[PDB]
Design an enzyme around this catalytic site. Sequence first.
Site, PDB file in Angstrom:
ATOM      1  N   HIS A  42       0.831  -1.180   0.000  1.00  0.00           N
ATOM      2  CA  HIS A  42       0.000   0.000   0.000  1.00  0.00           C
ATOM      3  C   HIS A  42       0.861   1.223   0.000  1.00  0.00           C
ATOM      4  O   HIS A  42       2.130   1.179   0.261  1.00  0.00           O
ATOM      5  CB  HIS A  42      -0.967  -0.014   1.227  1.00  0.00           C
ATOM      6  CG  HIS A  42      -0.334   0.375   2.517  1.00  0.00           C
ATOM      7  ND1 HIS A  42      -0.903   1.303   3.357  1.00  0.00           N
ATOM      8  CD2 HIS A  42       0.856   0.024   3.084  1.00  0.00           C
ATOM      9  CE1 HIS A  42      -0.113   1.493   4.391  1.00  0.00           C
ATOM     10  NE2 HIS A  42       0.956   0.716   4.260  1.00  0.00           N
ATOM     11  N   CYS A  52       3.872   5.443   5.380  1.00  0.00           N
ATOM     12  CA  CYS A  52       4.125   4.262   6.179  1.00  0.00           C
ATOM     13  C   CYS A  52       5.572   3.790   6.037  1.00  0.00           C
ATOM     14  O   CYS A  52       6.144   3.837   4.945  1.00  0.00           O
ATOM     15  CB  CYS A  52       3.171   3.134   5.749  1.00  0.00           C
ATOM     16  SG  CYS A  52       3.279   1.606   6.682  1.00  0.00           S
ATOM     17  N   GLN A  84      -6.713  -2.705  10.570  1.00  0.00           N
ATOM     18  CA  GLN A  84      -7.937  -1.858  10.610  1.00  0.00           C
ATOM     19  C   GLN A  84      -9.033  -2.314   9.618  1.00  0.00           C
ATOM     20  O   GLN A  84      -8.750  -2.769   8.472  1.00  0.00           O
ATOM     21  CB  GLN A  84      -7.580  -0.403  10.379  1.00  0.00           C
ATOM     22  CG  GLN A  84      -6.580   0.078  11.387  1.00  0.00           C
ATOM     23  CD  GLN A  84      -6.239   1.528  11.224  1.00  0.00           C
ATOM     24  OE1 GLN A  84      -7.101   2.414  11.344  1.00  0.00           O
ATOM     25  NE2 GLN A  84      -4.984   1.792  10.942  1.00  0.00           N
ATOM     26  N   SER A 114      -5.336   5.795  10.146  1.00  0.00           N
ATOM     27  CA  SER A 114      -3.952   6.203   9.792  1.00  0.00           C
ATOM     28  C   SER A 114      -3.907   7.248   8.748  1.00  0.00           C
ATOM     29  O   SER A 114      -2.907   7.975   8.656  1.00  0.00           O
ATOM     30  CB  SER A 114      -3.086   5.077   9.265  1.00  0.00           C
ATOM     31  OG  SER A 114      -3.187   4.040  10.150  1.00  0.00           O
TER      32      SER A 114
END
EC number: 5.2.1.8
Length: 145
Positions: free
Chosen positions: A41, A95, A113, A136
């Site tokens: 991601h 991230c 999540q 996030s």
Amino acid sequence: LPPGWEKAMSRSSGRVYYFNHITNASQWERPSEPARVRCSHLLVKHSQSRRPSSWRQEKITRTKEEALELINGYIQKIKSGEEDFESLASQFSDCSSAKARGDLGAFSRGQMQKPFEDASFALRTGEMSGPVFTDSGIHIILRTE
Ligand SMILES: Cc1occc1C(=O)N[C@H](Cc1nc2ccccc2[nH]1)C(=O)O
């Protein structure tokens, strides 16, 4: 159609297209549950993220709106073939998985999540989400296995 997928009418062209309300994916073409998936991601954080800080920027101040606009620019480049996902994830993901070209490894339900997990498990192998919102921040998710 598979889980999440709806038929819609395009408002520029009047052509039918398909969208997915769990992954926020959209595409012209008509689209063709595992125990584990593997995803990478790209995360763009904003001032209301749970942790407004990352390896790229100590204090993240961009608005949610501005994060969405960055996310949309990345999706455009990835879809035009102008940049590849891995190369944008490495450079621009908030991230720390940026360092592994966004790869998170494999995971099962119960670990991430819920909006990330749901989107992950609704993607087919090879498929990319649209903008997925979690505490996030805003993600583009690619299911790689
Ligand atoms: C510390 C770490 O190693 C890999 C991912 C992560 C991680 O959770 N990073 C978070 C950002 C984040 N939030 C997520 C939510 C869902 C999936 C991946 C996510 N990554 C952070 O830095 O605040």
